[PDB]
Amino acid sequence: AELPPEFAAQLRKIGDKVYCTWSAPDM
Amino acid sequence: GPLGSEDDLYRQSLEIISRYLREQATGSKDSKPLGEAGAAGRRALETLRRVGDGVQRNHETAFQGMLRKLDIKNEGDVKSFSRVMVHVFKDGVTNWGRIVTLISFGAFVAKHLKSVNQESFIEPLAETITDVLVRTKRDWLVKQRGWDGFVEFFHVQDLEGG
């Protein structure tokens, strides 16, 4: 029954890692 | 069709996002056709599905953790969802990985709502997601060729990158 702003941080960190994972190809 | 300024950007984006989130919520690997987003819709929906799944499946534990932590059940929750989405770009770095993460998150919640037969909240959610996501990134999206630039970025692996 409350919104702890951890999703914002988690999703942010995930996005950074995801972006770095998709930008870099299997080379 | 251009009526105001970037009307086309919203429609194409909404169609693809609405299709992707609703599709994934079914639990099956389906893919329904678009009404306006023909070229962009098929190119972006196919890519958004492949990328959205890869992102959410990899960080599934984190997504589920937040999914169980989230108290989202009504139309009032969208305020926090939209805030979290825009909050991801609070540093000013509009990276695709962050944008797609928010979409994969939306799809994750769409599934959560569909699992309990709450589609009535999925429509307004997908709408709020698309609206807020694009509203806070209008210039960036229009300058980046929209979904055209989006698909190319995630296709640098071995599809159309070089």
B59 part of contact set with chain A, CB < 8 Å: yes
A5 part of contact set with chain B, CB < 8 Å: yes
Cβ B110 vs Cβ B122: under 8 Å: yes
Cβ B20 vs Cβ B125: under 8 Å: no
Cβ B28 vs Cβ B53: under 8 Å: no
A27 part of contact set with chain B, CB < 8 Å: no
Experimental method: NMR
Tokens encoding B123 = 């429509």
- Which residues in chain A have their CB less than 8 angstroms from residue B83's CB? 8
State the smallest CA–CA distance between residue A12 and chain B in angstroms.
5
d(CA B53, CA B47): 10
Cβ contacts of B141-148, under 8 Å, gap ≥ 24? B141/B9, B141/B13, B142/B6, B142/B9, B146/B9, B146/B12, B146/B13, B146/B40, B147/B12, B147/B13, B147/B16, B147/B37, B147/B40, B147/B43, B147/B44, B148/B40, B148/B43
Helix (H) or strand (E) holding B126: helix B119-135
Contacts of B115 (CB under 8 A, 6+ apart): none
Cβ B29 vs Cβ B43: under 8 Å: no
For B49, other C-beta atoms within 10 Å of its C-beta total 19
Helix (H) or strand (E) holding B135: helix B119-135
Look up the domain containing A2 and give its range: 1-27
Cβ B11 vs Cβ B36: under 8 Å: yes
Number of helical H runs and strand E runs in chain A: 1, 0
3-state secondary structure of B38: coil
Rounded alpha-carbon distances, angstroms, from residue B119 to B73, B124, B152? 11, 9, 32
Contacts of A1 (CB under 8 A, 6+ apart): B71
Question: What one-character DSSP code corresponds to residue B31?
Answer: -
B73 part of contact set with chain A, CB < 8 Å: no
The structural domains of chain B, ordered by start, are 7-154 (1.10.437.10)
Max CA pair span of chain A: 46
Q: Structural domain tally of chain A?
A: 1
Question: What one-character DSSP code corresponds to residue A5?
Answer: T
Chosen for mutation from B56, B77, B100, B101 (greatest number of chain A CBs closer than 10 Å) is: B101
B111-134 residues labelled b (16+ CB within 10 A) or e (exposed): bbbbeeeeeebbeebbebbbbbbb
